[PDB]
Amino acid sequence: TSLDGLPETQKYVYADEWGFSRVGADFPPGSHPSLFSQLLPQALFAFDARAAVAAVAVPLAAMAAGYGWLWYMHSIAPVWQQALCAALIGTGYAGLFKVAHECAMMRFIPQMPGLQAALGTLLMAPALYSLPSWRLHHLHHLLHTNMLWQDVWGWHPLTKVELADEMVRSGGSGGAAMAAARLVLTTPIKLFASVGHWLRSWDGLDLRHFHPASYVEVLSGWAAPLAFAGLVLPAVVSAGGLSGFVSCYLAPWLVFHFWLSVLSLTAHTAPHIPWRAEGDGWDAGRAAVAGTVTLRLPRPLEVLLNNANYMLPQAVAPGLPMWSAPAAYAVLAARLGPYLTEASMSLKLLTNHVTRWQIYDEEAHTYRPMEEVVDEIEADLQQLAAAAQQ
Amino acid sequence: CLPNIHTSNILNFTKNYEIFKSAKDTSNFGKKIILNEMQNLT
Ligand SMILES: CC(C)CCC[C@@H](C)[C@H]1CC[C@H]2[C@@H]3CC=C4C[C@@H](OC(=O)CCC(=O)O)CC[C@]4(C)[C@H]3CC[C@]12C
């Protein structure tokens, strides 16, 4: 961790300065997250049908309510009513997508594996996502959490060195890639950068990345999104025209991607969480316990998202079901207390994420704003040009 | 003339093989699809 041994005063002033509640101390090296699976009571792993049907039915009810309203008042309503129904539908679908993510890791209904596979496929299709590819990318993420140059399926930060290289190649700060980075990680559109993730799935639609023994399974995975976008996105358009498309599909889609992106970005990024390269001090347990941030929401939001913010517990006990994630956290907070980091979703946090922590420099091993960093490295460009005198 | 083929060993093998292959089509390229289904977590 970045803030090593130091009294509670500087910890807490950093905490309320950045919007976190409890910052974290320092974890010993040489460990593994799967260790602390022994700190969990065995009753947490039990299956019950009540929570299952509740988790699959609450977000469905929210979605149905939003749609019934929106169709009852199709296009006679002003823009704010449309925005509110879109937000409701997007959140309901984020809940159903958390259920599908559970079925992808094989921990929702293990007794009926065919049924849980079919359910995950069905719930993932409307977001145009593939279930087998999702499983693969998530496993690869769990194996490489916070590893520099390797965690490509997470919010890999834009480092100073690659930026300097691109600026030396561009011959100035006016190129195309320059302005692209400029607007993507300086404006609120960052809270939607998850859409980039969506495009990096479909690994070129290239069966040459996978193991041959799995071709038929991967192909099938790609055919459920396509079939949707080939049989249902026509109907919608044909039955509502452009407007009946932008209000019935595109706005809930953008809301869902907001949820996905903000959840992940807040989860694994903070000024006191370093990104060590491989061989240079990367530790697995240290990165999965100390390098994680838990977001706290109002309980209505939580029960709508199926506890989608609680990510730390299911990284130490990958078989821990979804409805036991809150309780389990309370257990770990007792024993791993001094090391965890926590935050509450507020405006200050997102403003800091957008305006302050933009570039990651490894020498200082911290995040710094894009503009001051680029003008500093450009002044050093001028000074090496002066050093290039002869 | 004919070279007394029936007491030979290369000709007996080639004879039997050619007849068996000429009987009926023996290529099964579509049965190999099972080799692309060995990993499926369903
Ligand atoms: C059109 C709307 C209403 C329905 C949704 C369509 C999607 C299913 C399409 C449109 C955008 C497509 C993607 C656009 C970009 C690419 C990259 C492209 O591959 C490459 O560019 C390879 C690398 C290279 O060319 O250098 C093909 C796959 C993929 C992910 C495409 C997969 C299919 C996608 C997601």
Encoding tokens for residue A232? 């249902």
What is the C-alpha separation between A69 and A253, in angstroms, rounded?
18
> Is A108:A121 a contact under the CB 8 Å cutoff?
no
What is the C-alpha separation between A366 and A163, in angstroms, rounded?
15
User: Is residue A360 helix, strand or coil?
Assistant: strand
Q: Write out the DSSP string of A8-47.
A: HHHHHHHHHHHTBSS------SS--GGGGGGGS-GGGG--
Residue whose C-alpha is closest to residue A263's, from A307, A199, A211, A325:
A307
Residues of chain A neighbouring B39 (CB-CB closer than 8 A):
211, 213-214, 217
Q: Is the CB of A231 under 6 A from ligand 1?
A: no
Q: Identity (one letter) of the amino acid at A172?
A: G
What is the C-alpha separation between A279 and A100, in angstroms, rounded?
35
The total of other beta-carbon atoms located within 10 Å of residue A74's CB is 12
What is the C-alpha separation between A245 and A86, in angstroms, rounded?
12
Encoding tokens for residue A340? 């965890």
CA A130 to ligand 1 centroid distance, Å? 13
The total of other beta-carbon atoms located within 10 Å of residue A108's CB is 22
Q: Write out the DSSP string of A274-336.
A: ----TTTT--HHIIIIIT-EEEE--HHHHHHHTSTT--SHHHHSTT--GGGHHHHHHHHHHHS
- Least CA distance to B36: which residue of chain A? A213
User: Is residue A60 helix, strand or coil?
Assistant: helix
What is the C-alpha separation between A344 and A296, in angstroms, rounded?
5
- By most ligand atoms within 8 Å of CB, the mutation choice from A197, A198, A202 for ligand 1 is A202
User: Is residue A368 helix, strand or coil?
Assistant: strand
Encoding tokens for residue A20? 């976190």
The total of other beta-carbon atoms located within 10 Å of residue A103's CB is 24
- Least CA distance to B39: which residue of chain A? A214
Place of tokens 């990993």: B39
Q: Write out the DSSP string of A91-114.
A: HHHHHHHHHHHHHHTT-S-SS-HH
What is the C-alpha separation between A330 and A313, in angstroms, rounded?
10
Q: Is the CB of A128 under 6 A from ligand 1?
A: yes
User: Is residue A366 helix, strand or coil?
Assistant: strand
To one decimal, the resolution in angstroms is 2.9
What is the C-alpha separation between A275 and A156, in angstroms, rounded?
9
What is the C-alpha separation between A124 and A279, in angstroms, rounded?
37
**A268 φ, ψ (degrees, to nearest 5):** -115, 35
Q: Identity (one letter) of the amino acid at A257?
A: H
User: Is residue A73 helix, strand or coil?
Assistant: coil
Report the DSSP beta bridge partners of residue A159.
Answer: A360
Residue A265 vs residues A61, A185, A349, A351, A362: alpha-carbon distances, Å: 28, 12, 11, 13, 19
Strands (E), A103-260: none
Residue whose C-alpha is closest to residue A147's, from A282, A265, A311, A286:
A282
Report the DSSP beta bridge partners of residue A343.
Answer: A20, A295
User: Which of A134, A139, A214 has the most B C-beta neighbours within 10 Å, making it the best mutation to test the interface with B?
Assistant: A214
3-state helix, strand, coil in chain B (%, to 5): 50, 0, 50
Q: How was this structure obtained?
A: cryo-EM
Residue whose C-alpha is closest to residue A167's, from A355, A367, A376, A360:
A376
Encoding tokens for residue A116? 């849980």
Q: Is the CB of A242 under 6 A from ligand 1?
A: no
Q: In this structure, what DSSP letter does residue A359 have?
A: E
Instruction: Give, rounded to a whole angstrom, the gap between the first and last alpha carbons of chain A.
Output: 43
> Is A251:A70 a contact under the CB 8 Å cutoff?
no
Task: Estimate to the nearest angstrom the gap between the alpha carbon of A300 and the chain centroid.
Answer: 20
Q: Work out which ligand 1 atom sits closest to the CA atom of A204.
A: 19
**A366-368 vs A359-361, strand pairing mode:** antiparallel
Residue nearest to atom 14 of ligand 1 (CA): A199
Q: Identity (one letter) of the amino acid at A231?
A: L
Residues of chain A neighbouring B38 (CB-CB closer than 8 A):
213-214
Which value, to the nearest 10 degrees, does the dihedral of the CA atoms of residues A368, A369, A373, A375 take? -160
> Is A42:A295 a contact under the CB 8 Å cutoff?
no
Encoding tokens for residue A9? 């005063």
What is the C-alpha separation between A273 and A146, in angstroms, rounded?
9
> Is A286:A272 a contact under the CB 8 Å cutoff?
no
Residue A46 vs residues A49, A52, A101: alpha-carbon distances, Å: 10, 12, 19
H or E stretch including A86?
Answer: helix A79-104
Instruction: Give, rounded to a whole angstrom, the gap between the first and last alpha carbons of chain B.
Output: 67
User: Is residue A343 helix, strand or coil?
Assistant: strand
User: What angle in degrees, to the nearest 10, is found between the helix axes of A251-267 and A79-104?
Assistant: 60
**A360 φ, ψ (degrees, to nearest 5):** -105, 120
